[PDB]
C-alpha cells in the first residue's frame, strides 16, 4: 500500500511529464487539501491554475525524481525540475533561459488510493536570483 | 532501521533546538558529503560554517518537525523554523523581526547509523 501509493506518485510524476495536468488531478480526492508556504489551504482551483500555468511557461519541462520515501499513509519526493523559461509565470516575464530547480512534494493518501492532503517546499530562486 | 535511523534525526532536531551544533555534527559520518542547491558537494569546514552562522543569526530558533518519514536508509523530514532575526545573515544586518521557513532535510544513513549523504531544500521567500 506504501508501495501502492509511491506508484501513484510516479504516475503523477509521468503525467507531469508528458505535460499532463489533468492526468496528475486525477489522483485528488474530492475533499484534498492543498497548503502554500505559509500552511493555509489553497483551493483545488487555484492549484490546478498555477499548474496550468507551468505547463504553459516552462513547456519543456522534465521532472526526475531524485528520491522517494513511502511510509504508512505518507510519500514524500525530492525532484529536480529543469525547463526552458519560454512564458509569463507568476508574474515573470521569459528569459528563454534553462533553469532548474528542486523541490519537495509530500503527499498523504487516504485508505483508497487518493491524495487528501498536500504540501510543498519549492526552492524558487532560479526564476528570481 | 528505519525507526533508528528516524530516531536519530530527531535528536538532530534537538541539538539544534537547544542550538548545539555539535550534536547534530556528532551523527555525521567521518567521509559525510552534503549536497548544496545545486547538488555540489559542500565541505564540511564549510557546512559547520554556515550551521554556526545561523545559530549566530537566529539564536532563538525553533524546529518544528511537520512530518519525518523513513524507508530503508533514508529520512526526509519537512521542517518549519521560528526565530527571530538578531544577527547578520547571508550578508543581510539584523532586522529584529520575527521570522519563518519551511525546509526539507533528506539524510541518508550507514548500517552503523551515521548520516553518509545529506541534501536540503531551503524555501528561503518568506525570508527575504
Ligand atoms: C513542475 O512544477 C513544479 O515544478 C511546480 C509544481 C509541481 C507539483 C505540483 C504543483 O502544484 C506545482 C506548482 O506549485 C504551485 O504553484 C506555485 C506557484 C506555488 O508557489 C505553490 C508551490 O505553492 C503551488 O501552489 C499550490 C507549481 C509548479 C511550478 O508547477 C503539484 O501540485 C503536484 C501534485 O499535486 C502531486 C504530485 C506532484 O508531483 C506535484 C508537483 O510536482
Given at each position: 500500500?506504501?508501495?501502492?501509493?509511491?506508484?501513484?506518485?510516479?504516475?503523477?510524476?509521468?503525467?507531469?511529464?508528458?505535460?499532463?495536468?489533468?492526468?496528475?488531478?486525477?489522483?485528488?480526492?474530492?475533499?484534498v487539501?492543498?497548503?502554500?508556504?505559509?500552511?493555509?489551504?489553497?483551493?483545488?482551483?487555484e492549484?490546478?491554475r498555477?499548474?496550468?500555468?507551468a505547463?504553459?511557461?516552462?513547456?519543456?519541462?522534465?521532472?526526475?525524481?531524485?528520491?522517494?520515501?513511502?511510509?504508512?499513509?505518507?510519500?514524500?519526493?525530492?525532484?529536480?525540475?529543469?525547463?526552458?523559461?519560454?512564458?509569463?509565470?507568476?508574474?515573470?516575464?521569459?528569459?528563454?533561459?534553462?533553469?532548474?530547480?528542486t523541490?519537495?512534494?509530500?503527499?498523504?493518501?487516504?485508505?483508497?488510493?487518493?491524495?487528501?492532503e498536500?504540501?510543498?517546499?519549492?526552492?524558487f530562486?532560479?526564476?528570481?536570483?
Open positions: 500500500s506504501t508501495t501502492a501509493n509511491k506508484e501513484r506518485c510516479l504516475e503523477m510524476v509521468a503525467a507531469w511529464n508528458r505535460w499532463d495536468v489533468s492526468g496528475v488531478v486525477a489522483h485528488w480526492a474530492p475533499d487539501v492543498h497548503y502554500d508556504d505559509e500552511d493555509k489551504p489553497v483551493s483545488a482551483e492549484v490546478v498555477r499548474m496550468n500555468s505547463v504553459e511557461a516552462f513547456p519543456d519541462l522534465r521532472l526526475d525524481v531524485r528520491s522517494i520515501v513511502g511510509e504508512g499513509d505518507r510519500v514524500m519526493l525530492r525532484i529536480t525540475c529543469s525547463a526552458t523559461h519560454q512564458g509569463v509565470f507568476m508574474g515573470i516575464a521569459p528569459t528563454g533561459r534553462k533553469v532548474r530547480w523541490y519537495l512534494e509530500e503527499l498523504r493518501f487516504s485508505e483508497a488510493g487518493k491524495v487528501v498536500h504540501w510543498d517546499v519549492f526552492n530562486s532560479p526564476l528570481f536570483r
